[PDB]
């Protein structure tokens with residue numbers, strides 16, 4: 240079956256994606272409340288911090304796939320990669336990132352996430368040094384379409400192949416069917432060198448989430464399907480953890496049942 | 507301590523209502539591949555399919571009145587010892603093992619197990635093999651530092667351990683859970699294997715006139731607990747409860763599967 244139709248549907252829906260609302264729905268309290276150790280924020284940050292602390296994920300270059308208007312996914316990573324490439328389909332998201340990069344006041348304040356990262360990394364790093372390091376190591380913010388055989392376009396900047404990939408809430412939020420998800424994964428995988436690592440975070444059993452006016456339709460995937468897709472793309476799953484969304488965190492911004500975190504290494 | 511508040515509650519535990527609430531439709535319908543029944547069986551079948559879990563002697567901690575958790579396992583261990591706190595449960599297990607009247611019909615699960623393993627084995631041989639390899643059904647208390655305790659007809663130390671929905675369901679708190687995990691880890695010989703299945707974020711469940719208070723545990727908490735007990739988590743999976751399998755018998759949010767090895 241042709242993908243174009245579904246892809247065109249996805250592309251269209253995102254043209255109504257709103258950064259501001261997106262950030263508030265998912266990265267402001269209650270979801271953006273890092274105080275409760277059992278919330279989703281802390282758990283995500285713990286997964287990333289702990290994986291990097293094994294020292295097994297290192298290199299020079301890293302590419303964040305579908306960054307959106309967020310940087311939390313790179314807080315623990317920036318102390319291990321000198322060259323970081325951020326990416327997103329939407330220009331308005333790339334501007335939102337540019338806004339934070341310029342330390343402008345009208346930008347989202349990630350300090351809460353930064354402090355927590357420094358907190359669990361346990362190196363007595365103050366969050367300001369942490370944010371400073373990230374801003375310095377983000378070498379580029381590029382456009383991307385995971386549905387293309389070459390997601391970054393052709394002859395794009397991004398040093399290739401990247402030593403590591405990081406991607407949160409992208410693949411499953413932009414793929415019509417499960418076959419698309421698998422294809423999307425194979426496409427970004429061509430950006431990672433053999434032996435490289437992939438840090439993937441995502442929503443489990445989700446069909447919709449809100450980005451302001453947007454009521455984006457998402458393909459629900461399970462742990463089993465993610466694991467299966469990772470192996471089908473040539474990865475050895477090194478770690479796959481699941482977080483069950485608590486009742487108090489089901490604010491009505493989406494219908495997500497859980498969140499997965501996968502650490503896979505390209506074979 | 508004082509833990510024994512649970513002990514009293516389990517005195518009203520009715521094996522039949524338990525079987526009916528968890529192993530009869532809808533949860534007991536194995537036709538849906540996305541149901542919990544199928545998921546649990548795949549977890550067990552795939553693990554034993556790797557061929558790394560083998561030996562003589564295997565112990566099933568807190569078997570209750572169920573045998574499904576041993577369907578795939580019984581073809582890798584010639585000496586199987588099942589266990590449980592209540593005498594009522596041990597009698598229900600006996601009713602199935604001795605093929606007595608009023609025994610529970612596990613055929614659906616046996617068939618599914620045979621279907622999954624894909625060895626062309628009919629379910630009657632499967633049950634026959636399980637019935638023969640189960641030598642005895644002994645009492646147990648995962649809270650007593652020596653569960654089976656003293657001179658036990660159980661060939662300890664065992665080579666592998668299987669336990670489903672026991673630890674989190676008989677412990678009042680996380681610490682009591684962690685300690686109980688140590689009490690059973692003793693029965694397992696070093697380099698041995700533990701196959702652990704349990705409820706995720708559940709606080710209560712019914713079994714007839716019995717209302718049980720369980721310690722809600724997360725996957726993260728279960729892993730960390732496995733380590734602190736001297737294990738090397740080989741695999742950990744989570745099954746999120748579908749709305750249609752969320753009935754009035756409990757408040758379970760999901761189910762976890764853990765494949766761990768005592769190092």
Ligand SMILES: Nc1ncnc2c1ncn2[C@@H]1O[C@H](CSCC[C@H](N)C(=O)O)[C@@H](O)[C@H]1O
Pocket residue numbers: 249250253256304305306307308309312327328329332383384385386406407408409412413
């Ligand atoms: N075809 C496509 N290829 C790549 N990214 C896409 C895409 N279509 C939409 N996206 C982007 O995927 C993102 C999903 S939202 C996830 C944002 C962020 N990574 C976080 O963790 O919160 C949006 O930023 C959206 O613009």
Ligand SMILES: Nc1ncnc2c1ncn2[C@@H]1O[C@H](CSCC[C@H](N)C(=O)O)[C@@H](O)[C@H]1O
Pocket residue numbers: 513516519567568569570571572575590591592595646647648649669670671672675676
């Ligand atoms: N102190 C204790 N030590 C071990 N098992 C106990 C216990 N107190 C209660 N139990 C038993 O633990 C069981 C929990 S119900 C789980 C039954 C079965 N394993 C299944 O998968 O369905 C009950 O059969 C109960 O009698």
Ligand SMILES: Clc1ccc2c(c1Cl)CNCC2
Pocket residue numbers: 265270279280408412442445448493495497498
């Ligand atoms: Cl924790 C978290 C953060 C962001 C998003 C989600 C979750 Cl659960 C699910 N909807 C897509 C965006």
Ligand SMILES: Clc1ccc2c(c1Cl)CNCC2
Pocket residue numbers: 528533542543671675705708711756758760761
């Ligand atoms: Cl699938 C299944 C089987 C048994 C039990 C449960 C579940 Cl979800 C939860 N309550 C404890 C007993």
